[PDB]
């Protein structure tokens, strides 16, 4: 090793005056820069367009956080050209030089962390700690993938020797690919999806989510300052399906890395399976597509610990996480004690503009607000509303923490990903039934169990079919390196982020034999 062992970046809690002072200044400076315009980034240069995209503050949507250029087909075509041109030489950088570039980018990101956190607060409505966790995870992806990439450098393939021959097997990167990123972790996941493939010699055209174009631009400012060669990373914010679909379907797109909704993920996977006219390879598509994640609590659990973990898991970042607890499955003995505790905790959660560091900021957009409120109306005819279920006062998209109980396991609110602060509570007889209910959704991303019974935990380890399973703690906030992150079933393709296995997805193997 040429660098210190990987450790996770600390997540700031802002309990020191020093941290508060630094954050207040960062927020003030980001606020003072509202209205700034950020161009596209293609082939090493900032490229403007006639059309613009607007990014609003979800805590006060009359406020424009910033604008960006808007990519169309011509810009996508230019990005593809730049990315393939860059690939020709980027693929042949020694791995230590690519990894060093990543480490430089991590150092630069770390030095701008308060600024990036403040931008998340304003652009996507994260409170302070949610913002800090996001930026810390992004730094983690860079630090982790820089180190992981070294494990694939030659020699890395175990082969059986043969007499009179030299047999060499080695990995090579795939080419130029497309990243389609989500709005909910628009520093962390945006960064990881791009830097993983780039680390091992691929080039990337990245399409940020519409709601998070400004913070995506700032990440590109970092990539640019770090000195990635022209074309290695490209930034194409865009409205609607145009540029994303064009890139996914293009015969010259080698791979697609996607994190977002199941509806979109299904379309991408289907498109990736088709041979576009003139295409000369089988596209790889990595899709991470959300969840309907449950926490099971049985009567042996620490009910106070469970209630706290449930509230954190359900309502952190307003439940806008693919890992969020949206189902709470309670055995008969656990039902009253746990539900009472969850209600008492949840009813005390504050909701307000994200800059004030409330427990919950707003949901991310007017459209998200409409969807969550619509699911709340649906829930009213499926289960019993016992907390919240209302839009609060204010211009921001403020929705109260919401609980439905006695929810049928096959109810729409118990099956479909709402991605808002809406918890569905399901009552079951025992742990066996809890597992059946937990597994009976199309998804399989995260799950948790609060229980002191060792046999129930072991049972869940074997039978609770989720990619990331947690015992006696929150089910959100998977840490890079610690918990390889990715799911089963309709939660996606099990591309485990923050794990050595992630980078293998972006490599192919060549075997060369010389007979002497």
């Amino acid at each position: 090793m040429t660098v210190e062992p990987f450790r996770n970046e600390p997540i700031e809690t802002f309990q020191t005056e020093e941290a508060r002072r630094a954050m207040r200044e960062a927020l003030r400076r980001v606020r003072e820069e509202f209205g700034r315009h950020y161009p596209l980034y293609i082939g090493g240069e900032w490229v403007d367009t006639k059309e613009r995209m607007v990014s609003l503050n979800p805590s006060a949507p009359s406020e424009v956080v910033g604008t960006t250029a808007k990519a169309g087909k011509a810009e996508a075509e230019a990005a593809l050209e730049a990315a393939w041109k860059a690939f020709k030489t980027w693929k042949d950088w020694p791995q230590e030089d690519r990894s060093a570039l990543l480490l430089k980018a991590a150092a630069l990101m770390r030095r701008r962390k308060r600024e990036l956190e403040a931008t998340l607060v304003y652009e996507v409505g994260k409170n302070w700690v949610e913002a800090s966790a996001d930026v810390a995870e992004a730094i983690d992806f860079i630090e982790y993938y820089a180190r992981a990439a070294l494990r694939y450098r030659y020699p890395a393939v175990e082969v059986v020797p043969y007499p009179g021959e030299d047999n060499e097997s080695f990995y090579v990167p795939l080419g130029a690919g497309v990243v389609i990123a989500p709005w909910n972790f628009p520093v962390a996941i945006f960064t990881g999806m791009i830097m993983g493939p780039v680390a091992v010699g691929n080039t990337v055209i990245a399409k940020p989510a519409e709601d998070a174009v400004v913070v995506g631009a700032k990440v590109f400012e970092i990539f640019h300052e770090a000195g990635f060669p022209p074309g290695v990373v490209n930034f194409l914010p865009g409205v609607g399906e145009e540029v994303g679909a064009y890139l996914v379907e293009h015969p010259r797109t080698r791979f697609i890395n996607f994190t977002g909704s199941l509806e979109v993920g299904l379309k991408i996977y289907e498109a990736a399976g088709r041979l576009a006219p003139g295409q000369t390879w089988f596209k790889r598509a990595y899709v991470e597509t959300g969840g309907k994640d449950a926490i099971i609590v049985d009567e042996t659990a620490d009910f106070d610990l469970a209630a706290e973990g449930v509230v954190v898991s359900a309502y952190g970042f307003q439940g806008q996480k693919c890992s969020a607890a949206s189902r709470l499955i309670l055995t008969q003995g656990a039902y009253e004690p746990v539900l009472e505790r969850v209600l008492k905790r949840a009813e005390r959660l504050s909701v307000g503009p994200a800059e004030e560091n409330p427990d919950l900021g707003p949901v991310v957009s007017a459209e998200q607000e409409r969807k969550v409120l619509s699911y709340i109306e649906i829930g009213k005819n499926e289960g019993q509303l016992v907390l919240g279920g209302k839009r609060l006062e204010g211009e921001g998209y403020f929705i109260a923490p919401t609980v439905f109980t006695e929810v049928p396991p096959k109810a729409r609110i118990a099956q479909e990903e709402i991605f808002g602060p809406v918890l569905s509570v399901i009552r079951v007889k025992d742990f066996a039934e809890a597992l059946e209910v937990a597994n009976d959704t199309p998804y399989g991303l995260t799950g948790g169990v609060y229980s002191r019974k060792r046999e129930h935990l072991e049972w869940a380890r074997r039978e609770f079919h989720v990619g990331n399973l947690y015992f006696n703690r929150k089910i959100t906030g998977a840490l890079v390196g610690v918990q390889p992150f990715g799911g089963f079933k309709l939660s996606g393709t099990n591309a485990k982020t923050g794990a050595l296995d992630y980078l293998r997805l972006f490599l192919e193997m060549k075997a060369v034999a010389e007979r002497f």
Copy 2:
């Protein structure tokens, strides 16, 4: 390790009297059993059907070598039910016990090798050494995957620890999947495609190629005798697209492992990308889809060595290999010396009934004969026929070794996979142009270079874009363990057979965290 280190099974050369006697005995036993009928194998039992399939001797197509049952949708459905039922417990066998089952199967196969070789001779027209190599490779896949599977047993995932927590990441098998196997290596590839997924806890429904159903049945006799639990492996010979299509498109098929034509592979990959009604996962499809493989020779080469390797590569098993040299790219200084030597060698090759151990047996079927003869007619309008290009006398599908010269790089016979004994010769100026021509096809499976110039070999190592590249030797016959086998581009998904990486394709990862 609990067993001896892997070594490749010896390929019999039949240079001893005892080996020749043993083969003659096996040929006798096999033909005495030409009247045999082989049922389907589903859920641990041989299951017959009303309809039957006939398998013919391509060296004497009026001679029936066996009949099998014929699977339809009802049988495919029954096999899926059996495979999923088996998976429920097979997934939880300790790896050492699954691996021991494979090792038992390898020992049984080894004891029946002459019988299997003789069956290859009569059913698919392999000469003696081609048959021996095939069976040896099958045994290799079993021995190799049994050992490789251990590398994925817990603990196998490197994770970063976190204070106060136990973090466990481990692999689990996917479920029940489908294998669609080729006729050209119907012991080796049939066996490896099934045994890889099975070794790590998946269950498999296998559809043998129509032309090789009898030998597929004999492999299943070995699986049955070895004692794989009911439903773990299933055998569904079938006519046409019915059974394969049904299985590929089924919402409860977890993965598809395919080796065969590009036409079929493209359809399978597209179908795998679709969500069938009620499907609850993203299907994995591994496809290996052929090649248009070239050998480059420059003026520094050992011309005699090159000519021998070219003839072996082009005409071994009548050119019916995804790895076969179908293009010979000669620099100007190499052109006459190499072409003269190739023509002199090739014109001396014997063609006849496979059991007589000729250099070439027949092509596999009337349909293959029609395809190859059609390409010869196409070739006559594109290049210059200088050797062969004819059907020889006999009921058997005997086609002479064929050479076309002055073939334009973009000609159909220089681009499309003929899968017959047809070599296209292309004259180029120099090594740089040789590489340009080598790369300008939609494929990227195998390639070779005969050259003594070290800088040309390194150039090819970097620039000759094929998954399996060979210097100064034949480009066919990749050995399990030694040369991970699989290609780039439209040669498929780079699923490297006979390599540790192969098994990872049939696993997903779960991460379980306990906070104490």
